[PDB]
Amino acid sequence: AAKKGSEQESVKEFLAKAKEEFLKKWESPSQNTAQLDHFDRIKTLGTGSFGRVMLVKHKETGNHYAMKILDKQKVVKLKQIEHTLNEKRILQAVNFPFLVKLEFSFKDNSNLYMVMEYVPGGEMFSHLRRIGRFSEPHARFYAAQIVLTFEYLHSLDLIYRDLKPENLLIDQQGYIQVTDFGFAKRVKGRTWTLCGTPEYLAPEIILSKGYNKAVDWWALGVLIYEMAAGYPPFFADQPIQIYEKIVSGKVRFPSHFSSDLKDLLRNLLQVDLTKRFGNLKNGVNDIKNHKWFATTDWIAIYQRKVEAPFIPKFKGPGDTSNFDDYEEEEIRVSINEKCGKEFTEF
C-alpha cells in the first residue's frame, strides 16, 4: 500500500491532467445552455426536498434525459442556496466514467433545471432491496467504482457527502453512475456542515467536529456493508438511536462475511480518524491494496471492460420500468422572477 511504482505514477499523471481540465470548467462554468420548451416531459423518476427528477425527451435530438427540477423558493427556505450552487458548479466541471453527465442547465422565474444523461437501469437501492443482498464479488465490483470515483473527486478537493444506494444508478452496461451532488463541496480545509443521510454519517459529523474527505471513506464502509449484508451496520427507527450506534465504536458483521471483508470494514468504519483507511499516509492505496480487493483490476474497471454482475432489463428507449411510480405534479412557472439575486450565477 506504500509502494510508489509505475502504476502509482500513472495514476498521478492521470489525475494531474484531470485537474487541469476540471479547473478550467470550475473557473468558467457553463450557464443557460437550454430552455424548458426544448424538452417534452414524460414521467417522474424520483423526488426530493426541492422538486423532482423527470424523464424528458430533447426535441431537437430525440435523446432522453433526466431533468432535475428545483424550486428556488424551496431551496431558500431550506437554506440550501450555496449547496445548490455548489452542486451545479461541480457537476458541470467534472468528467469521470462513474459520474452522471450534466448535458444542460438553465433557470426560469420559478425553478432551477439540471438535465443529465438518463441512466435507465434504476437505483442500486431498488435492486439491492429486491434481491436482499449482493454477493461479495458483486459488491466488490460496485465498491471498486466508488473507490475510483472518490479518488478522482478528492484529488480535485471535492467531498461528496451523500453516498448511499439511492444515489447510485445502474447503466445499461451494469456500471454505476453517481448522482445527487447536492452536498458536494470543493474545500481544502476542514468543513463543518451537518449534512448527509443518518445511516451514512461519520461520527465526526454527528459530534460537530470539523471534518474532511475521510467522511466519504467512512460512508464507503457503510455502503459496502449494506451491499453485502442487505442492511446497514447502524439502523434503528429513530435517527438519534442510529447516531448513538455510530459513535459507540461498536460494529457487528453477518456470519457469512469473509475474513477479508470484515478486516476492510473495521478499517473503514474506524471512529478514530488517525486509523481510518483512506485517511492515512498511503491515502486511497490502503484501500486499493487491501486483500479484499486483490482480484480487482482497477484499470479494467475504469475502462468498463469487466463483466458486470447483471445488465438491467431494457424494454426500449424511454422505458422507466426499473423506476418506481411517483405522483405527477404540473410544473408551474410564475410570471414574476423569484430569488434572482440568490441564484444569479446558476
Partner: peptide
C-alpha cells in the same frame, strides 16, 4: 435475525438526507 429486524423496521425505504 438482524435481517428480519431490518425488514420490520421503518428504515427500509428511500432515506432522506438531513441538514
Amino acid at each position: 435475525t438482524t435481517y428480519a429486524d431490518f425488514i420490520a423496521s421503518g428504515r427500509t425505504g428511500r432515506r432522506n438526507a438531513i441538514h
